[PDB]
Structure 1
Amino acid sequence: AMAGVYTYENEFTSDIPAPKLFKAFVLDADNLIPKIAPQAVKCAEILEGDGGPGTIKKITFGYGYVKHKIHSIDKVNHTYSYSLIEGDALSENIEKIDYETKLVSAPHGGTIIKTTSKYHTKGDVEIKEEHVKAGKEKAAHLFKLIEGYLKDHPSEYN
């Protein structure tokens, strides 16, 4: 019954400018990711809301699905936050996970992507280093694919 929050932060870099990355990775993820990784995302459907705060999305992938609830989108600052509210990473021990991502402009025109994950826990906390790392290496593979797409279609997301 003990409720708590485990917070984990991570950061990676890109040569892609922040605005373009924001438009592609963040704002057009429903459309872009199916294109470059049909297994990571087959389908995204909005179940309620506009597409801004409060929006609920169902994401189906090549098998199972998750639901995301959008908390905020700050287009001007290039920050985004949303929670995993249904899916297999959840349990009686992890009731939900909040993500917050910030795209910061690097010195030479690229980006530093900073992500905070907050696991809302119940009872004893058990969180394996190996599952956290497997999550980062999966995301990084898919991020590298997005970067490749943006470099292969330079007239997009300007």
Structure 2
Amino acid sequence: AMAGVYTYENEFTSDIPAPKLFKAFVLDADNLIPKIAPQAVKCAEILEGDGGPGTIKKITFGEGSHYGYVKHKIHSIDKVNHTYSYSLIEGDALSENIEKIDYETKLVSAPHGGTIIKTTSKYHTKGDVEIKEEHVKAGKEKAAHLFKLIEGYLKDHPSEYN
């Protein structure tokens, strides 16, 4: 049975400077996200580990989830370089034919003072590979919205994540 890896890059941009964002979005996601999108994210909970490399998180969704949750395994976190890698491993985007999805995200400092969020997504496939543009671009939008909500919030809370 054919094993393979579908790979998809995209970027977003943001006014928020890289480090604030990293603290908010990566480092306190568990807390900050449910606060600002309770429609779409009920809860977030660490099943195992500190929360560094090797941790397993269950994230629990509200409306607009096929399965109503995911689990993530954190592969790495680099606070100094502002990068993050993990793997979706059980739940929402997966199936018999998509064993796993890997994300790696690099925040980079744009011109001038702002940020560029670079994400690379890696679909570990089994068997024939059908991966619909929809399911993928639908995903882009979800994340794009979510980052927009973070910008907005953080701009309304400048005493935070400094």
1:26-63: CA deviation from partner (whole Å, max 9, x where unpaired): 000000011110122211111111110000001111x7
Unaligned residue ranges in structure 1 (runs of 5+): none
Greater shift, 36-45 or 104-113, is seen at: 36-45
| TM-score of the two chains, using structure 2 as the length reference | 0.95
1:107-132: CA deviation from partner (whole Å, max 9, x where unpaired): 21000100000000001100111111
CA distance in 2, matches of 1:65, 1:53: 21
CA distance in 2, matches of 1:30, 1:73: 15
Extract structure 1 runs of 4+ deviating beyond 3 A: none
Equivalent position to 1:76, from 80, 83, 106: 80
> Please, what is the CA RMSD of the aligned residues?
0.9
| TM-score of the two chains, using structure 1 as the length reference | 0.97
CA distance in 1, matches of 2:74, 2:152: 27
Q: What is the count of residue pairs matched by the alignment?
A: 157
1:52-86: CA deviation from partner (whole Å, max 9, x where unpaired): 0000001111x711100000000000000110000
Unaligned residue ranges in structure 2 (runs of 5+): 62-66
CA distance in 1, matches of 2:92, 2:14: 29
Query: Residues 33 and 40 of structure 1 are in contact (CA less than 8 Å); yes or no, is this contact kept in structure 2?
Result: no
Sequence identity percentage: 100
Greater shift, 117-126 or 136-145, is seen at: 136-145
